[PDB]
Design a protein around this ligand. Structure first.
Ligand code: 2L1
Ligand code: 2L1
Ligand code: CL
Ligand code: CL
Ligand code: CL
Lengths: 695, 697
């Protein structure tokens, strides 16, 4: 059910031990010693990773290492499609702008922060949540020259439970993290977009890196003189596998949750955020799909844009399914009613007053928030020519010195970025006509961005004519129209350009809405501090976890499948046989690697197959995870590595507001499948040899 | 494998059935010399199966079986198709024109009689042994002079089984006054609609209720207001005990066709020609139709039924090809024929191997012709609507070329033109479909094999299919209403003889018939070799574990209530519930709308004695019985012979079951009788139907 603070391990230990945990408490998390927590890293600022050897070998997801694999790929050595397997440490590829963060120490600094906050004076100050203010307190507690006296170490204070608890983290950051291994994309991203958020899952979502450091194991930027880090702790790999009901636990960095949403915030999330994103993306994707299906060249140009739009579209459908079917609104309503009844009995009205302030703030901002989501989904991300070039103040104050050519060169660079090899003006006009037709039906004339008033005023409500006129008369409507402008440029031409005016007025409205909506965040945040304080005072902090905030957490549960719908059961484990069932040679998403297909046919599974001779691929668990948990180590009752978390099923996206015991599952790549791929596909025996594999 | 057994085979199967759970006495299920459960089974409306469930001739069958009757009685004032129908008294039950119910009164093995008559052979290659005309002459000879007049209501029929190695004579009793009694709303009767066709899990209450009427003595009689409900020889008791995983279940019914004795070469032909062509051509046709329906709401209305009709056999072919690819169907037929060949070689009889060789050689010989036939049938005959545009008859052309019968010829041509270009026909949609279909057809069929008019694509239009199709509509008398009316005002035979649409329609139908004529001779050598092939299989492995192919005759099948795993890590259980209907509810999708009375029954848990032990309301179950088309509406029985459900479908994974039964995938999809009784009771409120049934606790 929860995403627990490391401090909460003491209070959860007896429940974990009854559920199957076998390791000693301090072997998992020791606040003043070495523990398993010391083998967990925040990988590249978003993902989780884990150290799996005494030479700093790190495992994370393939989608986590995707950018590094792509940056080292060329036409001659396409690592993204073929996989990468460094046969010696010297062949491991350095990565620019990478980092791994270890959580060296964690301390409760609540009383210290609350004492410092007493000097504020202004009761409505937001300093209690300010990263700048909390950094000043972190620095004061750690000392003037902390990072100079403790190289590689840094401090950070974060707020938890809406400002009712504060923790100081002592972090050790390494920036020389080299690419060691990766399966082909056919394995690393087998399901590709079709199987995103899907269980059963057959994706070998892993990649391998290595942390390098100076001669003393201290952090150091990339240098050819750097040596592999010898860490104080690494995970042992288990080859014992998993069974239904086995205890499983994860450590990682879940990003965000909204477990303390009021019922009014759940209604707002459904009726505004989700319904608008669903409606607008369905229109956009429908036009894009029609055009991609009709022209093979349009499919090539728009495939990535279509897939990117689909990600949050699918998430919103999953979230709305939970709101409709799992009683999310009703459960938040019962939580707040129970606090209100308890507050009335204790004679303290501040809790009911805080819930009232959140409801009133939500109700007040409804029209503005609807307008913001409509323009953001409908135009800002919906229409490509909304991001067409807008001449800067220095560019207009250059066209009207011979630096007219410099301004034109900068405008041309932005025009070529907008109208690139993947941009179709015809596809964009079709998308804009459908998107604007919906936007104009939903937003009244008086709330429209200034240029969109021309649809009714100048074009007699003809959206197609308004869009045609933008491209026909704009200097960014075609290459020939831009070149005619670039030969005889004038500020008068740019100031009256229909595309520039559209882009300017839609971005003006988008910013004006953002500015009007920003003040509504603070009364909700302040009321949440009081709301969560009451929930904690009423029921305690030993069943009510703090919202995720990109900090180290543990979660535990069992390896267990679930029933998605009447008469259908999805088991706890997928197999290599399931990859072969999904093979479609003429569908790029479901192509199967020839070496992997050969391994399956010859049953060359070695020590990685289960007791029945079947090769495991992935498993699912009742652990509570979210975005940020990608690459998290999944542990046995003994703390041994049994897999890597890589996804969550769509039925569990609602889990960020309310954990769903009968539907929500973490989707995990089995460590036996990771080793089978390293061994039989990569042939990288040295990686297997440096790991500590337990029978 | 697990089969469709002849009623005669019950004796030799009984011990296996009893070990599997059967509790009833053999002769209570089927007795050739007296009343048995077989007497409560009917062939409903010439295709479906039905069952008698009361001493007043009440009959249950599927909703899709009674669909046409429910539709024929529906008006804007009383829409029975949409709202359901529930006659509150026998006098309110609606008669149906052109309906029938057939009872299988007697079944007799007449193999020796037919084989003796066949010895009067004037030609060894004679196909009389399979001729319905010849076999009817033998049935009439055995039954007697004027049997029909001496026994009003009874008729006799002889059918061939096992490719002509076994013959049975059926004495049938036919009733034609069968009245509509009850039907749930279409939202229950066809809940999944086309989306859930061939799908398990299934949540459809696929049932309808009729009543057999007869004269005062229970003898068949056409509709008359003086007709009285039939008191039957036997009826099914209804069980409210339900089903559990692994329970014994059995069915009786009329499976239509199977191909259990296909050679491996016939399996390859079915996959590589029949299925691959139907899949490829229908995917092209459906793709164009879908794009046009999605772009225009009026095109969606006009083409929805045509699109759904094309999808039925398309989905079946995909399901059939999945079994051929994954279940080793070709290999299993190959092993069957190799085993017979080895046994034939040891017996000193080469005729079995010679028969398999004749089938393979015939299949190989007809390959190019069969490919051309399926290409034109799927690609043009079915694929392009203007292929069925009007073609002036010989007498119509004669009438146009010095009498007042010219207006008569134009009125008949106009009637056919208005039927082709009806309210659901779009010439623009048809031109788009034709351009895609012809492009594929022209790529597959070389110039020398093309229908005559299609040679104009290369010869006159420089390979431009779009221009050839545009020219057909621009210049044809049937290209638009205005073009037809201009023809009808000044009609000439010269205009019709050069019409590009008439020439297209004529030449594609000419090629279709020429191909059919050249392919027909190949059927008989295969049929004759199959008689020898199946005779050998029967002599080798016995008439014990291999059943005769389905041929629309009464058969029984048995198995267990059991789910299955469709793919890695996925399990479908044996039973669906009312909770599954509620999960699928979509008010703005006509296929998944939920009846308000049914939704209220679910919310109030007003399930009475119909819910299972855990308080859940069952809807449907699946079983390992071996069924096919023709088994719609079949009674599903308990170990005690009590009615536990009605068969209504089969999962797509089991369509390969017509060639080879698939124990781990194939399942009969059955509506639970508890859900039928719940709908009659809580949705229809038709208590008199419950009261006339014999319900066992
Ligand atoms: C609940 C629902 N409504 C329309 N479609 C569906 C099923 N969706 C639900 C949302 C989703 C997201 C990612 C991947 C698959 C799916 C399946
Ligand atoms: C095996 C297969 N090949 C393409 N699609 C599929 C999946 N199934 C699943 C859906 C379905 C329903 C009825 C008939 C056939 C099928 C096809
Ligand atoms: Cl370390
Ligand atoms: Cl012989
Ligand atoms: Cl099987």
């Amino acid at each position: 059910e929860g995403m627990w603070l490391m401090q909460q391990l003491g209070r959860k230990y007896a429940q974990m031990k009854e559920r199957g945990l076998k390791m000693k408490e301090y072997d998992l998390y020791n606040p003043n010693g070495t523990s398993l927590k010391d083998a967990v890293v925040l990988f590249d600022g978003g993902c989780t990773g884990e150290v799996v050897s005494d030479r700093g070998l790190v495992l994370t997801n393939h989608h986590c290492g995707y950018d590094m694999i792509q940056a080292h790929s060329t036409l001659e050595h396409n690592y993204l499609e073929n996989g990468f397997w460094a046969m010696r440490e010297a062949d491991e590829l350095p990565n620019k702008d990478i980092s791994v963060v270890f959580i060296d120490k964690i301390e409760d600094v609540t009383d210290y922060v609350k004492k410092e906050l007493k000097a504020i004076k202004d009761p409505n100050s937001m300093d209690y949540l300010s990263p700048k203010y909390l950094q000043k307190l972190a620095d004061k507690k750690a000392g003037k020259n902390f990072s100079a006296k403790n190289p590689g170490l840094s401090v950070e204070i974060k707020a938890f439970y809406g400002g009712n608890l504060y923790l100081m983290f002592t972090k050790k950051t390494y920036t020389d993290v080299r690419l060691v291994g990766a399966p082909p994309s056919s394995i690393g991203k087998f399901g590709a977009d079709t199987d995103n958020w899907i269980w059963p899952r057959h994706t070998g979502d892993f990649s391998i890196f290595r942390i390098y450091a100076d001669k003393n194991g201290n952090p150091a930027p990339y240098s050819e003189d750097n040596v592999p880090l010898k860490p104080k702790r690494f995970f042992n790999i288990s080859l014992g596998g998993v069974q239904e009901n086995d205890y499983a636990m994860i450590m990682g960095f879940p990003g965000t949750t909204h477990r303390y949403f009021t019922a009014s915030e759940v209604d707002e999330w459904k009726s505004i955020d989700n319904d608008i994103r669903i409606r607008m993306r369905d229109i956009r994707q429908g036009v894009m799909l029609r055009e991609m299906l009709a022209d093979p060249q349009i499919k090539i140009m728009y495939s990535a844009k279509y897939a990117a739009s689909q990600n949050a579209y699918k998430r919103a459908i999953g979230a709305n399914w939970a709101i409709k079917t799992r009683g999310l609104r009703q459960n938040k309503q019962a939580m707040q009613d129970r606090l209100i009844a308890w507050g009335a009995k204790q004679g303290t009205p501040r809790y009911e007053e805080a819930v009232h302030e959140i409801d009133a703030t939500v109700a007040k901002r409804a029209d503005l928030r609807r307008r913001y989501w409509m323009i953001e989904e409908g135009i800002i991300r919906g229409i490509e020519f909304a991001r067409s070039p807008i001449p800067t103040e220095d560019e207009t104050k250059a066209l009207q010195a011979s630096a007219r050519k410099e301004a034109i060169d900068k405008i041309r660079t932005r025009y070529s970025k907008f109208a690139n090899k993947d941009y179709s003006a015809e596809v964009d006009k079709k998308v804009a006509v459908a998107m604007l037709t919906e936007y104009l039906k939903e937003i009244p004339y008086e709330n429209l961005p200034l240029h969109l008033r021309l649809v009714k005023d100048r074009f007699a409500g003809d959206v197609q004519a308004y869009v045609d006129d933008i491209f026909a008369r704009s200097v960014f409507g075609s290459e020939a129209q831009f070149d005619a402008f670039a030969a005889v440029p004038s500020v008068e031409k740019l100031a009256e350009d229909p595309m520039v005016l559209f882009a300017s007025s839609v971005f003006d409205e988008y910013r004006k809405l953002y500015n009007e909506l920003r003040p509504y965040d603070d009364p909700i945040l302040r009321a949440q501090r009081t709301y969560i304080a009451g929930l904690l005072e009423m029921d305690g902090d030993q069943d009510q976890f703090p919202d995720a905030n990109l900090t180290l957490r543990f979660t535990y549960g069992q390896v267990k499948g679930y029933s998605p719908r009447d008469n259908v059961y999805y088991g706890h484990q997928t197999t290599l046989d399931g990859v072969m069932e999904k093979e479609d040679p003429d569908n790029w998403e479901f192509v199967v690697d020839p070496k992997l297909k050969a391994v399956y046919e010859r049953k060359d599974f070695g020590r990685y197959a289960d007791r029945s001779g079947r090769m495991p691929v992935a498993f699912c668990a009742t652990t509570h995870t979210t975005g940020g948990n990608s690459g998290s180590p999944v542990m046995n009752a003994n703390g041994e590595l049994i897999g890597l978390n890589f996804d969550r099923n769509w039925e569990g996206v609602g889990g960020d507001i309310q954990y769903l015991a009968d539907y929500q599952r973490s989707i995990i790549v089995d460590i036996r499948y990771v080793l089978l791929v390293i061994d039989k596909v990569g042939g990288c025996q040295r990686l297997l040899d440096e790991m500590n594999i337990v029978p």
